[PDB]
Amino acid sequence: ATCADGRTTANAACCVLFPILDDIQENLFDGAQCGEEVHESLRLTFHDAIGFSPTLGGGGADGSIITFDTIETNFPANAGIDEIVSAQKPFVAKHNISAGDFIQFAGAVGVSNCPGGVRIPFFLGRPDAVAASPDHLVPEPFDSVDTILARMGDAGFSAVEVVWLLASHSIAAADKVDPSIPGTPFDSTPGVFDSQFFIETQLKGRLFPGTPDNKGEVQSPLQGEIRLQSDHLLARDPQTACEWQSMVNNQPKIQNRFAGTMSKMALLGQDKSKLIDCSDIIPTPPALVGAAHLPAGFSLSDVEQACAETPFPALTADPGPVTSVPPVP
Numbered sequence: 001a002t003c004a005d006g007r008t009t010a011n012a013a014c015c016v017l018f019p020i021l022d023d024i025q026e027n028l029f030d031g032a033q034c035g036e037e038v039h040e041s042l043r044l045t046f047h048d049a050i051g052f053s054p055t056l057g058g059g060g061a062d063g064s065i066i067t068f069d070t071i072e073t074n075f076p077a078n079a080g081i082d083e084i085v086s087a088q089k090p091f092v093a094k095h096n097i098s099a100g101d102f103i104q105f106a107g108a109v110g111v112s113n114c115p116g117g118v119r120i121p122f123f124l125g126r127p128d129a130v131a132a133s134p135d136h137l138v139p140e141p142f143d144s145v146d147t148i149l150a151r152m153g154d155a156g157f158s159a160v161e162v163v164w165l166l167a168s169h170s171i172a173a174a175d176k177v178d179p180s181i182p183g184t185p186f187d188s189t190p191g192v193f194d195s196q197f198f199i200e201t202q203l204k205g206r207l208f209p210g211t212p213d214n215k216g217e218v219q220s221p222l223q224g225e226i227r228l229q230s231d232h233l234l235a236r237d238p239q240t241a242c243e244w245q246s247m248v249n250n251q252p253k254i255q256n257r258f259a260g261t262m263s264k265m266a267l268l269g270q271d272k273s274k275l276i277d278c279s280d281i282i283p284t285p286p287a288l289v290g291a292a293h294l295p296a297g298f299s300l301s302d303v304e305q306a307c308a309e310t311p312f313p314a315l316t317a318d319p320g321p322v323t324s325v326p327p328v329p
């Protein structure tokens with residue numbers, strides 16, 4: 001099919017996305033950047049989609065977190081989500097796709113702006129949200145590992161799929177876990193979709209980057225990096241530890257598994273055969289920048305081995321003394 005301005009796409013319903021792509025690239029993502037708005041939009045895909053259970057209900061990836069914002073943004077597990085919901089709302093109102101479709105589209109577009117990123121499949125045609133999600137369907141960083149894995153499992157994900165989705169934490173920061181240090185990332189490269197998250201979570205903790213005693217937080221290995229309790233534990237749990245380690249220095253696996261599993265997440269509560277494939281709209285991501293490494297001054301002795309089948313791979317350390325991670329502006 002050929003769209004209004006001459007750009008082409010396999011299925012013509014997808015032509016509606018070209019002006020939306022242009023608008024979000026220029027006015028939401030600040031000229032197609034991998035920064036705060038991309039990170040927040042990616043988080044939103046999950047907080048919308050995971051509100052789905054075959055028994056507890058919820059419509060999944062249905063735009064409910066925007067349409068029923070006054071309900072859902074008040075759930076404790078949605079702390080800080082209000083900002084991006086408020087930013088996306090005028091875009092939904094202006095354009096001609098459902099809120100559910102917009103959230104997933106913006107997330108996919110955003111990931112495609114990140115160096116090292118991947119093209120996530122995108123389908124069009126989610127109907128409007130019917131009702132707000134039930135509360136208590138979104139995992140929290142202080143939930144038991146078995147509880148997180150069961151909740152994700154209930155929604156449809158295997159334990160290894162949870163690991164693959166958590167590649168998102170490679171381009172991610174926290175504002176509310178420790179409010180004294182907003183914008184503190186989960187890895188040393190929050191602008192690069194890479195394996196540093198999987199490496200750095202495996203290191204022995206050293207310090208709190210801000211205050212002690214924050215719920216859902218444990219010690220980090222690096223000044224300027226924050227470590228979630230859940231990530232600490234998932235890196236170490238027999239169900240997930242070997243898969244976690246397998247991501248280290250395996251960029252193609254991180255990319256391919258993230259894309260496939262994000263597609264699955266984007267379709268929670270939906271039926272792929274009742275949607276239209278618009279995957280070819282998503283731009284081509286920039287190449288990976290950097291290579292897998294231990295932080296400067298670290299060695300393999302600083303890694304906590306938790307995979308019972310295979311030792312952690314030898315990685316070179318950055319040269320010099322250990323330094324500090326800058327916050328996401």
Ligand code: HEM
Pocket residue numbers: 036039040042043045046079080139140141142148162165166168169171172173174175176177178216228230
């Ligand atoms: C598996 C259980 C998960 C837990 C417990 C968890 C927890 C968290 C927490 C506590 C934050 C910081 C929020 C704040 O204080 O500002 C965060 C940020 C984020 N989460 Fe996860 N998350 C999980 C899964 C996911 C998944 C599956 C995705 C996939 C899209 C995702 C994407 C993000 C992103 C991109 C951010 C960064 C947002 C920003 O920079 O402001 N998370 N997550």
Ligand SMILES: [Ca+2]
Pocket residue numbers: 047048049050051059060061062063064065133
């Ligand atoms: Ca939802």
Ligand SMILES: [Ca+2]
Pocket residue numbers: 169170171187188189190191192193194195196197
């Ligand atoms: Ca990274």
